[PDB]
Every structure is written in structure tokens, then in C-alpha cells.
Amino acid sequence: RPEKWVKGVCRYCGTGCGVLVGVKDGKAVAIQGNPNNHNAGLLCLKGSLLIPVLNSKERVTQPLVRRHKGGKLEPVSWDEALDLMASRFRSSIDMYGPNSVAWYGSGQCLTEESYVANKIFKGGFGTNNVDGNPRLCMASAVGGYVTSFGKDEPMGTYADIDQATCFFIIGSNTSEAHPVLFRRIARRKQVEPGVKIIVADPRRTNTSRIADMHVAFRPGTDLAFMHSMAWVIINEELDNPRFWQRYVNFMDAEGKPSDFEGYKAFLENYRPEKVAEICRVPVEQIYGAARAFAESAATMSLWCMGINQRVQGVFANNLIHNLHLITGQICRPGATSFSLTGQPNACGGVRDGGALSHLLPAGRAIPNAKHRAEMEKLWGLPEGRIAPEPGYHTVALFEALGRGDVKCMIICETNPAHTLPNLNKVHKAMSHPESFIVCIEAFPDAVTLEYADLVLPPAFWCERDGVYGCGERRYSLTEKAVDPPGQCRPTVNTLVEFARRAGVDPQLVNFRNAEDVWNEWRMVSKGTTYDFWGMTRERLRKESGLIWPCPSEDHPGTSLRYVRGQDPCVPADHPDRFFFYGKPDGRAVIWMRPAKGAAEEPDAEYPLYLTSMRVIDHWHTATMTGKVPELQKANPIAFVEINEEDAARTGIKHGDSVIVETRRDAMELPARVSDVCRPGLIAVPFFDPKKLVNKLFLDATDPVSREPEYKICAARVRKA
Ligand SMILES: Nc1nc2c(c(=O)[nH]1)N[C@H]1C(S)=C(S)[C@@H](COP(=O)(O)OP(=O)(O)OC[C@H]3O[C@@H](n4cnc5c(=O)[nH]c(N)nc54)[C@H](O)[C@@H]3O)O[C@H]1N2
Ligand SMILES: Nc1nc2c(c(=O)[nH]1)N[C@H]1C(S)=C(S)[C@@H](COP(=O)(O)OP(=O)(O)OC[C@H]3O[C@@H](n4cnc5c(=O)[nH]c(N)nc54)[C@H](O)[C@@H]3O)O[C@H]1N2
Ligand code: SF4
Ligand SMILES: O=N[O-]
Ligand SMILES: [C-]#N
Ligand SMILES: [Mo]
């Protein structure tokens, strides 16, 4: 039994449940939920079974080197490993310039790790080649939040769940992907049974079993569906002119200033009867969803990958925001437009930290000369050290690696050989014979390690301390609960030594530990609308998270952004009750985005949509959840969901083996037969390394956010 409990954060989803880690004699023995965090001491099965993951001996515990391409990976000392890393990166720069090198990181890295790596690269080497897996995930929501509101991140919090009276859940399997939050959604409807839930997703998932209405629309057509909802809202006079006349601007299909009549005129193109056939849904679903949405006392929307992983990803985020803005279902408890973040730290580490190729910390942008100067000053750099061109975004990064333009890359706390789209193309790029790939990776069964030239053994999870920022602007600390095993070291320390040895100015990496970097990050946020200077380590050790803006030590944090009296970034003396201060006139923007479809729609040759999805027992590539026997009990291996009425028509029975084929590859998979998938749709999970499904998927990206369309491509099925 535990002699002490160590406060931290669940290693997995963007719900960011707080955890207490029971330790006895330097060994973790137990785990419970933080009663004092938003989750109220509740964890899902994954969270509960983190202790066997932390205790696993199946770890990378010494540095490894692959002397030659194709060779065995063999033990090498830390000092040799760091010199090789430093010397290779420094030579690449020396010879070919800063853009020859890259960082490919993670929403699972601590905020401090991503902060150091971002600084080393952008301020140290002089390259903006810094990107990470939230590009694969949250970049569409950043675009939607920035274009609609002028600033990133939700404006409500999880607490709004407890007061909503309608939930519109689109592109989200909340029960399998954010279990604690789904339980909270179900709980609210349990307590207030008048509560209405619309679940919009081409698949019928466990999330829909609390839904008043499940809209099983055809993949790609939710933009039309959502415009059609605004038509209805407008048509039946369910909109909120006192709101939008004061607080909202309208932009036409060309992106030019327009107005409410322009909005109305545009929406004539999305009448319910016409859009109902596009979407393959009964028309009464458009009227029902719209009315529930608008008539409800308070409406909260929630979405994830089905919206974001799309070539029209940004546009889809805007269309959700349009509904909240036309109705004024925003800036009020219960009423908010809440994008769900998938990773434990995409928000804290990557989005807020500006650890993407076009960004700078705390709201700043690379193309922006003032922001560059603001950072050169804060970081003590010579003028112009920060390059004015964005670096390579993830897809183009790995394309650049394939061409030989990026010669040295660091991969940290991600598994891109398993999780990048269009894998045959990526595996080739990653096999460039003159590339130097360094992997910071905790588990030896990560398929990406088959591409690494050097592997560095990290402290995992609560083997070290640092901050995770979840989907609700909550910054929570994990304190160190146990020692790392073998030769495992905190990546914050590894990065500093790397930098130092590679000729970076030591004033740039002046950090003994992760606390040191936090204090600087605190400083770099100060005065911005991301200001969290009031989150001292002391505060974060005692509290179970603070929600930013939190500009000072006597400030409790912020639940309602953009709201006079609740958001410290809204001047107390501001004339209006709301203030969208990310736009220069204080107004949010309704965008009249034309509705299109997938980059690769089905046709005669490939008559099926193919989608890819989460499953509850498995975390992404299964290098962690795979260490837990109980998590292997329901879904041990990959499958392909097939619709019943589709199956029968083509002579496919259940458990039967099928070849899923697309323009790029062909994979045998046992068929799972249900009404889960709507007619003309199949779905594959991605946790199985023996079934690298991203070999089938296309690579196309939102032209703005550069997120890949993993959620749609054209496939075909054939009895093995
Ligand atoms: N158990 C578990 N939980 C997790 C994770 C995990 O690996 N395992 N990972 C986390 C991460 S990083 C993320 S990003 C999230 C992902 O969480 P979600 O995005 O909620 O989960 P997904 O299954 O990826 O996709 C949700 C739905 O998108 C739907 N979809 C497909 N096409 C379309 C479309 O055209 N329109 C719409 N509106 N929907 C569509 C699919 O039917 C699917 O049911 O979950 C997080 N939580
Ligand atoms: N087809 C398809 N593909 C997808 C998606 C999809 O919906 N469909 N979803 C996309 C999305 S949203 C995301 S978020 C990505 C996620 O894709 P990845 O980030 O590739 O998936 P993970 O399995 O989370 O990889 C994290 C790695 O970190 C390692 N690790 C764990 N702890 C530590 C540590 O302390 N230090 C270090 N250095 N390493 C550690 C783990 O062993 C693991 O190998 O997948 C994307 N890929
Ligand atoms: S819902 Fe997410 S944060 Fe909460 S315990 Fe489950 S996996 Fe962890
Ligand atoms: O939960 N991985 O499909
Ligand atoms: C982030 N997922
Ligand atoms: Mo994600």
C-alpha cells in the first residue's frame, strides 16, 4: 500500500484527468483520480491501469546507435550519443544552412520540453523547422478559432457541460475518445432529462446511445448540413439579432465584408430539402438539430477528428462557430463552441507554446516582424536571428526529408512511421540513405525505431516533473513520483546538453530543470492574452490545475474568455459585455464557406468511403496500452467495420476475411458487421502495428491548417 500520493495528470487523452500516484519504497503501487481536479477523482479504465505501464521493463533504458543504414541498433554511451547528435546537426547547419535540420515533436511532450526544443531550433539554429503531431490533429481547430475569433483555444471550459441544455456533438466519439467527459455529458442529461443531445457522425457509436438524434450523414457533407441548420435558424426567426448586430461581422464566400442579408442570400444555397439528399439524411433531422440548437436555454457544441481531419477542416470549424454566433449561444455558462483536443498536451505544449512551423510562443506569428522582434528581445537574440519564413509543416517536412533537403531530424514522443498518412510514401522518405534521424522514445516496439540512426532513452511520464495543458485551458503539474530506470534522462536536460554541445549560446538554454524553463515560459506569456504569469510552480504543486488567462498570483484563473468581468484581458471599463479582442473591432466573424467534399471522393472504381477511428481500449499506436493485458481483451487485432445492408448486397458475412483496397495499398482485415457504419462506408482502427492502415490513406491536406484528411478516402472491398 502507498506511503505517499504524488499529484499529476493522466498520461493519455485531452480530458486531462488529474491522477494521484501511490508510491511505496520508490515504486508506484496504486493510482486514483485527483479528487481536486475537474474529473473529481474519476478515471476511465486506461487511466486506472497506468501503473503497469509505468512499471513495465519493456523500455529503452540505454542510448542506441545504428552505425550504418539497415544495420543493427547497438549500445552506445550517452556522451558518444550526444556528441554524434551535436556534431551531425552542427555540420548540417555549417554546410547547408539551418533549414537542413528539423524537430518533429508532440502534444505528449511536456510543455517545458517543447519550449526548449522550439527555442533551440528557432532562436538557436535559426530555423522554423519545428512541428509536431498536433498538426495531424488540432491545426484545423486553431485555424477555425483564429479566423472566427482572432485567438486560439476554446472560450468556455468543461464546467459548461454542467449547464448546457443542448449538446451538438459532431465528429466525436466522446465515449471512446474522452470517456470521463462523455460520462459528464451523460450525467448532465441524467440530472436534467429535458437536456437534448444531437450526435452527428457517419458512424453509430456508443456516444449516440445517449443522443436524442443521431445524424448519420454521408462523409464530407456536414458543411452543407450545418449551413442548412443556419438557414432553418434564420428562416424560423430563431436567431439572435441583438447579439450578431453588435458582436458579429459577416464574410462572403470570397472572404470579403458582407452582411446579414448577404448571409441569408448565401444560405439559400443550403435549403433543408436539397441538403437532405446530399447528406443522405431524412429532412426532419435538419429542422430538429437546428431547432434544438437555437431554442435551447444553453447550447454547447463539441467536435473532434471527424471535423478537424479534413481538407475543409478549418471551414467546418468556422461553420460550427457560425451557429453559436448567429444565435448568441456563446459567452454564457452552458453556451459555448467547444473544440475537443485529443492529446494531453497539444494545447499547453504545442499550440500555446507556438511549437509549430509558422508560430511563436503565446499568440505570436513567424510572418509577423513585430512578433519576431518581441521574441528576439525576450530570448536575448541578435536581430533577425528568427527566420521570417515558416518552416516545413509535418507533411512537407517529411517530404523534405525524402528529397534530402532536411538531413537531420529529431523525432520526440511520437511514432510517425505508424501514424503519418500515406505510409508507403513516408517510409520511403524516412529511408533516405543519407538522413540522420534521432529518436527520443520510451518503448522499443515503436515501429519508427526501425528508421532511427540514434535512440535516446527518456524519463517517462512521472519519472520527471512538468506541465500538461488539456483541452480546457487547464495547466496542471505532474510532480516526479519515481526515478527513471537504467540510463533514462529527462528530455529537458537532454535538450540543453544537445544545444550546448552543438554550439548554441548557453544563455539560450539556461535551465537546470523543467521548473527553470516554466518561469521563463511564464515571462514570455506575460502581457499576452495567453498570460499565465500567476501560475508559479508553488501554485501548481498545491492546486489541481489553473485555467489561463491567469496573469497574477492572486488571480483565480478564467472560465469565460471574451466576457467583461470574467476575462482579465477585457478591460474592466469596456463599453460592451463581450469583447472578441482578437479582432480589431471586437467582433467575431461568421464565414460564408462554400461546402465541398473529400479530396478523394468515391467513384465507380472505388465505391466506398474509408474512415479511421479510435477504439476505447487502445491509445494510438499501442506501445503503452499494449503493455496492459486487460486492455487487449475486447479488441486484440485490427478489423474493418462494414455496414449490414452493404454486406448482404455483396455477399459478406461476419468474421469473414476481407481485402480493403485503395489507390495506394491493399490490406486483409477481418470484417466486423453492424449498423455502426452507414451504407457506403467502412472503417479501420490504427492501433495495430501488423496492420499499418495509414498505408491505405491519402495525404491531402487542408490548404490553411495543413492537417491531413485521415477521416476520408475512396476504398473498395473484396472477399479474400
Ligand atoms: N481510447 C482513446 N482515446 C483517445 C485517443 C486514443 O488513441 N484512444 N486519442 C486521443 C486523440 S490524440 C484524439 S485526436 C481524439 C480523437 O477522438 P475522436 O475524434 O472523437 O475519435 P475518432 O474515432 O478519431 O473520430 C470521431 C468520429 O469522426 C467520424 N467521422 C468520419 N468522417 C466524418 C465526417 O465527414 N464528418 C464528421 N462530422 N465526422 C466524421 C468517425 O465516424 C468517428 O466516429 O481522441 C483522444 N482520446
Ligand atoms: N488513420 C489515422 N491516422 C492517424 C489518426 C487517425 O485518426 N487516423 N489520428 C492522428 C492524430 S489526431 C494523432 S494525435 C496522431 C498520434 O500519433 P502518434 O503520436 O504517432 O501516436 P502515439 O502512439 O501517441 O506515439 C507516441 C510515442 O511516444 C512514446 N513515448 C511514451 N512516453 C514517452 C516519453 O517520456 N518520452 C518519449 N520520448 N517517448 C515516449 C510512445 O512509446 C509512442 O511511441 O495520430 C494521427 N494518425
Ligand atoms: S478520460 Fe482521458 S484523461 Fe481521463 S482517465 Fe481516461 S484516458 Fe485519462
Ligand atoms: O485507438 N486507435 O485506433
Ligand atoms: C492533439 N491531438
Ligand atoms: Mo490527436
PDB file of N, CA and C in Angstrom, residues 261-303:
ATOM      1  N   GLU A 261     -28.018  40.105 -44.719  1.00  0.00           N
ATOM      2  CA  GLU A 261     -28.769  39.830 -45.929  1.00  0.00           C
ATOM      3  C   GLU A 261     -27.935  39.024 -46.902  1.00  0.00           C
ATOM      4  N   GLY A 262     -26.645  39.345 -46.969  1.00  0.00           N
ATOM      5  CA  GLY A 262     -25.701  38.546 -47.729  1.00  0.00           C
ATOM      6  C   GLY A 262     -25.676  37.144 -47.161  1.00  0.00           C
ATOM      7  N   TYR A 263     -25.591  37.020 -45.831  1.00  0.00           N
ATOM      8  CA  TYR A 263     -25.619  35.696 -45.180  1.00  0.00           C
ATOM      9  C   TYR A 263     -26.863  34.914 -45.602  1.00  0.00           C
ATOM     10  N   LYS A 264     -28.039  35.532 -45.432  1.00  0.00           N
ATOM     11  CA  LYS A 264     -29.321  34.966 -45.866  1.00  0.00           C
ATOM     12  C   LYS A 264     -29.343  34.542 -47.342  1.00  0.00           C
ATOM     13  N   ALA A 265     -28.767  35.370 -48.212  1.00  0.00           N
ATOM     14  CA  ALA A 265     -28.764  35.108 -49.647  1.00  0.00           C
ATOM     15  C   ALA A 265     -27.922  33.902 -49.984  1.00  0.00           C
ATOM     16  N   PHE A 266     -26.741  33.838 -49.366  1.00  0.00           N
ATOM     17  CA  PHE A 266     -25.804  32.715 -49.454  1.00  0.00           C
ATOM     18  C   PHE A 266     -26.442  31.390 -49.018  1.00  0.00           C
ATOM     19  N   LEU A 267     -27.107  31.422 -47.872  1.00  0.00           N
ATOM     20  CA  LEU A 267     -27.777  30.258 -47.297  1.00  0.00           C
ATOM     21  C   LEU A 267     -28.954  29.704 -48.122  1.00  0.00           C
ATOM     22  N   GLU A 268     -29.426  30.449 -49.116  1.00  0.00           N
ATOM     23  CA  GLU A 268     -30.470  29.938 -49.982  1.00  0.00           C
ATOM     24  C   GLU A 268     -29.959  28.709 -50.713  1.00  0.00           C
ATOM     25  N   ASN A 269     -28.635  28.624 -50.826  1.00  0.00           N
ATOM     26  CA  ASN A 269     -27.960  27.519 -51.490  1.00  0.00           C
ATOM     27  C   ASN A 269     -27.979  26.231 -50.652  1.00  0.00           C
ATOM     28  N   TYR A 270     -28.460  26.332 -49.409  1.00  0.00           N
ATOM     29  CA  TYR A 270     -28.479  25.194 -48.456  1.00  0.00           C
ATOM     30  C   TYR A 270     -29.836  24.966 -47.779  1.00  0.00           C
ATOM     31  N   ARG A 271     -30.906  25.022 -48.569  1.00  0.00           N
ATOM     32  CA  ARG A 271     -32.243  24.639 -48.109  1.00  0.00           C
ATOM     33  C   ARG A 271     -32.312  23.161 -47.675  1.00  0.00           C
ATOM     34  N   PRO A 272     -33.039  22.860 -46.566  1.00  0.00           N
ATOM     35  CA  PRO A 272     -33.122  21.502 -45.973  1.00  0.00           C
ATOM     36  C   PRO A 272     -33.460  20.350 -46.946  1.00  0.00           C
ATOM     37  N   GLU A 273     -34.360  20.602 -47.887  1.00  0.00           N
ATOM     38  CA  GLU A 273     -34.840  19.543 -48.773  1.00  0.00           C
ATOM     39  C   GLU A 273     -33.747  19.080 -49.726  1.00  0.00           C
ATOM     40  N   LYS A 274     -32.997  20.049 -50.248  1.00  0.00           N
ATOM     41  CA  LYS A 274     -31.881  19.813 -51.167  1.00  0.00           C
ATOM     42  C   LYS A 274     -30.666  19.219 -50.445  1.00  0.00           C
ATOM     43  N   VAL A 275     -30.386  19.738 -49.255  1.00  0.00           N
ATOM     44  CA  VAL A 275     -29.229  19.301 -48.476  1.00  0.00           C
ATOM     45  C   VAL A 275     -29.455  17.938 -47.823  1.00  0.00           C
ATOM     46  N   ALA A 276     -30.724  17.592 -47.623  1.00  0.00           N
ATOM     47  CA  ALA A 276     -31.092  16.308 -47.060  1.00  0.00           C
ATOM     48  C   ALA A 276     -30.709  15.170 -47.976  1.00  0.00           C
ATOM     49  N   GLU A 277     -30.817  15.364 -49.296  1.00  0.00           N
ATOM     50  CA  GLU A 277     -30.386  14.315 -50.246  1.00  0.00           C
ATOM     51  C   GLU A 277     -28.870  14.275 -50.432  1.00  0.00           C
ATOM     52  N   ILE A 278     -28.205  15.414 -50.243  1.00  0.00           N
ATOM     53  CA  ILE A 278     -26.748  15.468 -50.367  1.00  0.00           C
ATOM     54  C   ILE A 278     -26.168  14.608 -49.237  1.00  0.00           C
ATOM     55  N   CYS A 279     -26.759  14.775 -48.056  1.00  0.00           N
ATOM     56  CA  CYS A 279     -26.270  14.206 -46.794  1.00  0.00           C
ATOM     57  C   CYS A 279     -26.767  12.803 -46.541  1.00  0.00           C
ATOM     58  N   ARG A 280     -27.736  12.364 -47.353  1.00  0.00           N
ATOM     59  CA  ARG A 280     -28.444  11.098 -47.168  1.00  0.00           C
ATOM     60  C   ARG A 280     -29.055  10.985 -45.765  1.00  0.00           C
ATOM     61  N   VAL A 281     -29.702  12.066 -45.306  1.00  0.00           N
ATOM     62  CA  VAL A 281     -30.498  12.022 -44.072  1.00  0.00           C
ATOM     63  C   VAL A 281     -31.942  12.486 -44.272  1.00  0.00           C
ATOM     64  N   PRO A 282     -32.887  11.886 -43.521  1.00  0.00           N
ATOM     65  CA  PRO A 282     -34.265  12.409 -43.547  1.00  0.00           C
ATOM     66  C   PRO A 282     -34.272  13.911 -43.156  1.00  0.00           C
ATOM     67  N   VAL A 283     -35.031  14.749 -43.890  1.00  0.00           N
ATOM     68  CA  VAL A 283     -35.024  16.225 -43.748  1.00  0.00           C
ATOM     69  C   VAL A 283     -35.366  16.725 -42.369  1.00  0.00           C
ATOM     70  N   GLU A 284     -36.168  15.963 -41.641  1.00  0.00           N
ATOM     71  CA  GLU A 284     -36.637  16.338 -40.313  1.00  0.00           C
ATOM     72  C   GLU A 284     -35.468  16.417 -39.327  1.00  0.00           C
ATOM     73  N   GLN A 285     -34.345  15.765 -39.667  1.00  0.00           N
ATOM     74  CA  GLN A 285     -33.125  15.865 -38.855  1.00  0.00           C
ATOM     75  C   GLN A 285     -32.452  17.233 -38.882  1.00  0.00           C
ATOM     76  N   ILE A 286     -32.523  17.912 -40.032  1.00  0.00           N
ATOM     77  CA  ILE A 286     -32.012  19.285 -40.173  1.00  0.00           C
ATOM     78  C   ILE A 286     -32.813  20.281 -39.322  1.00  0.00           C
ATOM     79  N   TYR A 287     -34.138  20.249 -39.473  1.00  0.00           N
ATOM     80  CA  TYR A 287     -35.054  21.054 -38.653  1.00  0.00           C
ATOM     81  C   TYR A 287     -34.905  20.726 -37.178  1.00  0.00           C
ATOM     82  N   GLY A 288     -34.845  19.440 -36.821  1.00  0.00           N
ATOM     83  CA  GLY A 288     -34.702  19.023 -35.413  1.00  0.00           C
ATOM     84  C   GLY A 288     -33.424  19.515 -34.736  1.00  0.00           C
ATOM     85  N   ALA A 289     -32.284  19.276 -35.390  1.00  0.00           N
ATOM     86  CA  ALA A 289     -30.968  19.716 -34.909  1.00  0.00           C
ATOM     87  C   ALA A 289     -30.876  21.236 -34.759  1.00  0.00           C
ATOM     88  N   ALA A 290     -31.376  21.952 -35.770  1.00  0.00           N
ATOM     89  CA  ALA A 290     -31.398  23.418 -35.787  1.00  0.00           C
ATOM     90  C   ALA A 290     -32.233  24.013 -34.666  1.00  0.00           C
ATOM     91  N   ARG A 291     -33.433  23.464 -34.495  1.00  0.00           N
ATOM     92  CA  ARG A 291     -34.382  23.942 -33.514  1.00  0.00           C
ATOM     93  C   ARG A 291     -33.904  23.691 -32.080  1.00  0.00           C
ATOM     94  N   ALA A 292     -33.398  22.481 -31.838  1.00  0.00           N
ATOM     95  CA  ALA A 292     -32.830  22.087 -30.539  1.00  0.00           C
ATOM     96  C   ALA A 292     -31.699  23.031 -30.209  1.00  0.00           C
ATOM     97  N   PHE A 293     -30.761  23.121 -31.163  1.00  0.00           N
ATOM     98  CA  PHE A 293     -29.663  24.098 -31.120  1.00  0.00           C
ATOM     99  C   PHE A 293     -30.088  25.510 -30.679  1.00  0.00           C
ATOM    100  N   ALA A 294     -31.038  26.092 -31.396  1.00  0.00           N
ATOM    101  CA  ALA A 294     -31.404  27.503 -31.250  1.00  0.00           C
ATOM    102  C   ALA A 294     -32.395  27.777 -30.130  1.00  0.00           C
ATOM    103  N   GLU A 295     -33.363  26.874 -29.948  1.00  0.00           N
ATOM    104  CA  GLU A 295     -34.420  27.052 -28.939  1.00  0.00           C
ATOM    105  C   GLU A 295     -33.928  26.785 -27.519  1.00  0.00           C
ATOM    106  N   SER A 296     -32.963  25.884 -27.373  1.00  0.00           N
ATOM    107  CA  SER A 296     -32.428  25.572 -26.049  1.00  0.00           C
ATOM    108  C   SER A 296     -31.919  26.744 -25.187  1.00  0.00           C
ATOM    109  N   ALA A 297     -32.094  26.623 -23.893  1.00  0.00           N
ATOM    110  CA  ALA A 297     -31.705  27.698 -23.000  1.00  0.00           C
ATOM    111  C   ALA A 297     -30.189  27.962 -23.112  1.00  0.00           C
ATOM    112  N   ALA A 298     -29.416  26.902 -23.325  1.00  0.00           N
ATOM    113  CA  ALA A 298     -27.966  26.994 -23.447  1.00  0.00           C
ATOM    114  C   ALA A 298     -27.439  25.838 -24.277  1.00  0.00           C
ATOM    115  N   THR A 299     -26.707  26.135 -25.355  1.00  0.00           N
ATOM    116  CA  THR A 299     -26.189  25.095 -26.270  1.00  0.00           C
ATOM    117  C   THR A 299     -24.682  25.037 -26.339  1.00  0.00           C
ATOM    118  N   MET A 300     -24.137  23.839 -26.098  1.00  0.00           N
ATOM    119  CA  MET A 300     -22.696  23.592 -26.236  1.00  0.00           C
ATOM    120  C   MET A 300     -22.432  22.602 -27.372  1.00  0.00           C
ATOM    121  N   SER A 301     -21.528  22.957 -28.289  1.00  0.00           N
ATOM    122  CA  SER A 301     -21.043  22.065 -29.355  1.00  0.00           C
ATOM    123  C   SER A 301     -19.687  21.474 -28.986  1.00  0.00           C
ATOM    124  N   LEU A 302     -19.477  20.218 -29.416  1.00  0.00           N
ATOM    125  CA  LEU A 302     -18.220  19.506 -29.204  1.00  0.00           C
ATOM    126  C   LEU A 302     -17.927  18.689 -30.442  1.00  0.00           C
ATOM    127  N   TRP A 303     -16.670  18.732 -30.874  1.00  0.00           N
ATOM    128  CA  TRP A 303     -16.232  18.048 -32.079  1.00  0.00           C
ATOM    129  C   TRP A 303     -14.803  17.602 -31.964  1.00  0.00           C
TER     130      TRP A 303
END
